[PDB]
């Protein structure tokens, strides 16, 4: 099963994470203030950085109670000794608009950041948006569809 997590590699540095049972998990996240959902660990590229995305459906920090919060973190990886540190690749989050791309060009909610080289987790073994999207905005369009949401984390490969 950990050898399953080692097969988890990004596709052109992209992870797409489906959070199903959205309705229910939001309720648990209201009932419990530090309820954090985790993506599978994934590699930026085959012999690269191991990352993991986390989300708070009912927000964290400045977003607590009001927003979806999205974070990413570096994990200990098998190949850390062959990589540049600190981790400095640009990270882009998207909450996907689940509309048919044959009808209209879907409008993803998207933010991008460059890792700050002073944050401890980006150095050799979460960081992101506490207020990524508001509870009111997430019910617009098709961000929530069939009781699931899609979180995308794309890591810019050199």
């Amino acid at each position: 099963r950990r050898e399953l997590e080692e097969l988890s590699v990004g596709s052109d540095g992209v992870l797409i994470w489906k959070i199903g049972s959205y309705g229910r998990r939001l309720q648990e996240a209201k009932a419990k203030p530090n309820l954090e959902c985790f993506s599978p660990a994934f590699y930026t590229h085959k012999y690269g950085y191991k990352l993991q995305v986390s989300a708070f459906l009912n927000g964290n920090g400045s977003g607590e109670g009001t927003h979806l919060s999205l974070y990413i973190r570096v994990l200990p990886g098998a190949f850390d000794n062959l990589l540049e540190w600190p981790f400095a690749r640009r990270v882009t989050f998207s909450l996907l608009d689940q509309s048919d791309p044959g009808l209209a060009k879907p409008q993803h909610v998207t933010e991008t950041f460059h890792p700050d080289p002073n944050w401890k987790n980006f150095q050799k073994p979460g960081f992101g948006y506490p207020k990524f999207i508001s509870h009111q905005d997430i019910r617009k369009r098709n961000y929530v569809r069939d009781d699931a949401v899609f979180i995308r984390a794309a890591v810019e490969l050199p």
């Binding site: 964290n60 920090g61 400045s62 919060s69 974070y71 933010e111 950041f113 460059h114 700050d116 944050w119 979460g126 960081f127 992101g128 948006y129 506490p130 207020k131």
Partner: peptide, 5 residues
């Protein structure tokens, strides 16, 4: 906009 936690 980017921040810890």
């Amino acid at each position: 906009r980017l921040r810890a936690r």
